[PDB]
Amino acid sequence: NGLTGTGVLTESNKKFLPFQQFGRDIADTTDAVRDPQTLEILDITPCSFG
Amino acid sequence: FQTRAGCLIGAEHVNNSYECDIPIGAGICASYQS
Amino acid sequence: ETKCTLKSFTVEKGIYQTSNFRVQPTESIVRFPNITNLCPFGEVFNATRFASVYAWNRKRISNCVADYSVLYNSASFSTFKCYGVSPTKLNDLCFTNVYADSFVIRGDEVRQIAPGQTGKIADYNYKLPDDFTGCVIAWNSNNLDSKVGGNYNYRYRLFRKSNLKPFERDISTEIYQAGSTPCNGVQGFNCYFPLQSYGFQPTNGVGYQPYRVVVLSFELLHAPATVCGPKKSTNLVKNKCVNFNFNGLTGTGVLTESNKKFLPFQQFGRDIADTTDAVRDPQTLEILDITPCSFGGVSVITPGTNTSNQVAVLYQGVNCTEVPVYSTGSNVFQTRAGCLIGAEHVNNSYECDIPIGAGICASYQS
Amino acid sequence: QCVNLTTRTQLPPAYTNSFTRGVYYPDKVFRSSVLHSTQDLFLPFFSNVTWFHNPVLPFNDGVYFASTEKSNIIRGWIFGTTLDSKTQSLLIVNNATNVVIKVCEFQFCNDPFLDVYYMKSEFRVYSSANNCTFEYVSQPFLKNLREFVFKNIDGYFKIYSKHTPINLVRDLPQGFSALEPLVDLPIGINITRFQTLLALHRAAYYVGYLQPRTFLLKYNENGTITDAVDCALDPLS
Amino acid sequence: FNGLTVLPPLLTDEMIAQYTSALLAGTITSGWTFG
Amino acid sequence: SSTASALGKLQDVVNQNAQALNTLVKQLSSNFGAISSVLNDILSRLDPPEAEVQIDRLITGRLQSLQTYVTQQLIRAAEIRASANLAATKMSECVLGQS
Amino acid sequence: EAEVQIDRLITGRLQSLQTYVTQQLIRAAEIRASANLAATKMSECVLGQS
Amino acid sequence: ICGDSTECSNLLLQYGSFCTQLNRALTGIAVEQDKNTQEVFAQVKQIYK
Amino acid sequence: ICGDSTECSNLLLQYGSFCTQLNRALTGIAVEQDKNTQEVFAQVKQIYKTPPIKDFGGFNFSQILPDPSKPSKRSFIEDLLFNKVT
């Protein structure tokens, strides 16, 4: 839905309130999104590096 | 081998315990014998 | 100098660092190869026929002596604009592999030929790199390149699948599929020829008369020099702090005969931290050497303006050979820390008052 | 003036190890007792190199061409896209006297050859040559291996060469030798394929391809490259 | 994370606790002689 | 006499100083976004109204590098001073008397 | 001009990273001094009587 | 400072070695921390009970 | 920064007094080094000398006392230390 980024997506148990679209924790780092079709909450984590 | 510091390839894991000479981390390190 | 540096009218006992010392150059030396042949430029500038923009004429010139003064002052050019070089300095520089591109374009498209420029000719006929270095010359050819019967021989590219590449030539002529169906070699609906012709006529006003444009491109030290300008060649000077212009490489130092074992293809060596150490003169082909002229900080030893007004001068890390207001002064002493003027050496040994270095120091008595 | 070669000799395209060959002087700057790192086109260490004991091979980016030839049978090279007059073609010939470099719209048959009469005078490699672009003549190039490196960068055809006597029977020697820069051709040609020429009476050579990577080079006291290390070969490297 | 990493210490907490235990047993039993 | 690498600390100090000098002198060969890394070429090749811009780029880059070098030197000097104070105390207490 | 904007971003981020590194160096020096004091105290007041 | 961008990396390339010394300083800090812990706690030849 | 270029010096002149600040720190560093050495080694007021006859109850200090034969007047261990490190 216009929010773009790289990562790996998993199932999440976070419960959005019925009008949000995504979440974040600190320093504006998106962590969870809601798909516009299924309307469920997923979780995003960055790809491994080191 | 899988370690708390990551993954190690090219080394063998043994059950003994010697003095630490090439520190790797998390309390383990490697040496030459192989 | 001490008073000015410390911003005070009184100075207490001690040694202070005021300024530095450098040895000025004496004369100049220029060394160029013995090449004196002229360069053909009227052949390409005064050519009777110029090709079209899509088939722009490409020419390579090297191994010649080109004088840009006679072309700089020429008033036959409407537009005379270079990018990376100031025109007045072209007579003072030497390049290799000069590339000349000549073509004919419309009057209003002259602005299209520029780095970081978009349009129709600039992206479909001739793409100039963003970091292009060189110059562009443009001049109106309505008097000879415009025909009363109409000039249709001049054509320009109009369509392509994508954008071109810098310094790319396209001569392919195929029908353009402007729609969702193949043309199959039929110039009909959604099918056009990528080349569009011109209607050059003398009766047409400005913005449509033919214009001849020649662009020149250079390189920056990728090979031994082959094309320079008219310049005078001097001789070689040894063991003198002078400045040199060896084949465009400009630098100041002292030139010394060197025994370094080059190999028959190097032109100039260096050492760690890419410092130009040795060079090869063009005419004589000798292994030279470059060493910087002497330099170093200076310091003043004074016992305090409260007591006296006579001082001593220390030149740091300088052998007592090129000292030159204190040309002579007093007796001159040589130390491990440099040279010293204005103090007298003794055989005694006391406590250290004003530390100087290498285990020696000075005090006031003189 | 040539016909199809009826006796279709087959050169077995074997594979052998590249080892540590293909090192050349990258620039024109003298150095001494310094370890310099440079990134350029090179032949990767310990790769496969094709051995032939004449087919058509692509030019790709650069070519490492080695020949442990005896009695100097190899003659020259052909470069181009389709080896026809429709496209610009390039020819290098190294006969008994001065070598000749030609750039014209030459035409060739299926299997060009030189041939020798036993009184040595025969040349029917090409068929036609109408439009010429470049001409050049130089000194002749020639138990003794001869190695060449051909590169095409910025309209410049760089040819590096080096020859060294050999005593090993078949495989490439496991030694080290840099390649001095020999000739630069200042002509821009869109080459994609190349050929080879033999001096038949009227067949072993190695071909490798280059890739862009970084090397570390050690200069001795006198400025001659004496040892090298390839970056992307092994963790130790 | 955005290109930053945290590395674990070489000594785990169990080893540090073991050092403290050894020091304390030594000072209880042997006084200052073991130093 | 026999075993080597017994004097690691002084060798490390020397190595760090030499490395700092080497990187400082090597920083002189960076474009810093300009068109050339050598000042004489840009002076003698190009027209002043933007040659000044190029010189400004070189100036700011080199000044920043020099500032970083000076700060590192200050930190190292501080730790060396601490070590020297410890050495002086040790030589006063253990050489001139029994500790 | 995209490259000019990228240049601004690059120089700003580089400056910030430099500041962080310098602050870390200062804090590390202070921590090292504290650790030396702790080592001396452990040597003296645990292994002997002061 | 680039976040996996080719043009950003190319532009950063012309700034010299501004990043080798940063990692060098950080590694020095880490080694110093390990040495601090080792020299403060490891002061016994054996392990008593 | 400038490498003997007047234009560079003129352009740098409008950047304030940065160079005085920079040069004022290195001088302090050098003075600090000198003071460090002086305060760590200059601990005594007189230069004592050992007697020529050496009978120290059986102890043998010959390896640590200075060697008159060597031009450097350094002991054996000091020479080993000097040669060991670059």
Ligand SMILES: *[C@@H]1O[C@H](CO)[C@@H](O[C@@H]2O[C@H](CO)[C@@H](O)[C@H](O)[C@H]2NC(C)=O)[C@H](O)[C@H]1NC(C)=O
């Ligand atoms: C192209 O031809 C013109 C002649 O129309 C050249 O211009 C003249 O060159 C002569 C050379 O002796 C000078 O004496 C004249 O003063 C020039 N101007 C005129 C109006 O006659 C021009 O130089 C030629 N092009 C080049 C590149 O040389």
Ligand SMILES: *[C@@H]1O[C@H](CO)[C@@H](O[C@@H]2O[C@H](CO)[C@@H](O)[C@H](O)[C@H]2NC(C)=O)[C@H](O)[C@H]1NC(C)=O
């Ligand atoms: C200062 O310079 C002079 C002149 O170059 C040096 O004198 C030379 O010393 C060398 C070494 O003994 C001799 O081979 C030359 O013949 C001397 N030349 C002259 C003209 O006397 C002098 O050694 C230098 N001083 C220092 C401290 O380096």
Ligand SMILES: *[C@@H]1O[C@H](CO)[C@@H](O[C@@H]2O[C@H](CO)[C@@H](O)[C@H](O)[C@H]2NC(C)=O)[C@H](O)[C@H]1NC(C)=O
């Ligand atoms: C250099 O020559 C090769 C042919 O050897 C050209 O490759 C052709 O490219 C066109 C355009 O994509 C294709 O339609 C042809 O099929 C290709 N031919 C072959 C044999 O593969 C190449 O384009 C040429 N490059 C330049 C810059 O002229």
Ligand SMILES: *[C@@H]1O[C@H](CO)[C@@H](O[C@@H]2O[C@H](CO)[C@@H](O)[C@H](O)[C@H]2NC(C)=O)[C@H](O)[C@H]1NC(C)=O
């Ligand atoms: C050799 O050169 C001649 C002269 O340019 C070529 O003849 C021209 O070829 C082009 C190619 O498209 C045609 O457009 C011209 O009409 C031809 N002109 C004449 C007078 O024939 C010839 O094609 C070239 N040979 C080869 C093999 O390309």
Ligand SMILES: *[C@@H]1O[C@H](CO)[C@@H](O[C@@H]2O[C@H](CO)[C@@H](O)[C@H](O)[C@H]2NC(C)=O)[C@H](O)[C@H]1NC(C)=O
């Ligand atoms: C570098 O070149 C020098 C100068 O020739 C070499 O030194 C002498 O070289 C000749 C001929 O090669 C020998 O006959 C001498 O025995 C050499 N003298 C010494 C003292 O070696 C030197 O050998 C060359 N270095 C290398 C690595 O080839």
Ligand SMILES: *[C@@H]1O[C@H](CO)[C@@H](O[C@@H]2O[C@H](CO)[C@@H](O)[C@H](O)[C@H]2NC(C)=O)[C@H](O)[C@H]1NC(C)=O
């Ligand atoms: C003190 O020790 C030194 C060696 O450290 C002794 O010097 C040796 O003396 C013997 C007998 O004279 C020689 O054979 C050795 O070569 C000497 N060694 C060196 C390194 O010089 C010295 O004799 C000892 N002094 C006493 C009084 O025992």
Ligand SMILES: *[C@@H]1O[C@H](CO)[C@@H](O)[C@H](O)[C@H]1NC(C)=O
């Ligand atoms: C010892 O090592 C072997 C092989 O690595 C492993 O299978 C085993 O679990 C280890 N421990 C014991 C107690 O054998």
Ligand SMILES: *[C@@H]1O[C@H](CO)[C@@H](O)[C@H](O)[C@H]1NC(C)=O
């Ligand atoms: C140029 O000619 C002069 C005249 O004889 C000669 O002395 C010099 O060596 C020549 N230089 C070159 C590079 O040919």
Ligand SMILES: *[C@@H]1O[C@H](CO)[C@@H](O)[C@H](O)[C@H]1NC(C)=O
């Ligand atoms: C320094 O000045 C003081 C007073 O300002 C004076 O008493 C003293 O004699 C002076 N020292 C000299 C002249 O050496």
Ligand SMILES: *[C@@H]1O[C@H](CO)[C@@H](O)[C@H](O)[C@H]1NC(C)=O
């Ligand atoms: C003192 O030094 C001078 C030269 O500096 C020297 O000639 C003289 O022999 C030395 N000794 C005496 C007692 O003058």
Ligand SMILES: *[C@@H]1O[C@H](CO)[C@@H](O)[C@H](O)[C@H]1NC(C)=O
């Ligand atoms: C070289 O070619 C042979 C073909 O027989 C192949 O087995 C081998 O893996 C190749 N070498 C490498 C490094 O891929």
Ligand SMILES: *[C@@H]1O[C@H](CO)[C@@H](O)[C@H](O)[C@H]1NC(C)=O
């Ligand atoms: C060898 O080539 C040269 C080219 O210049 C030619 O003059 C000469 O006749 C050739 N020799 C033979 C035997 O073909």
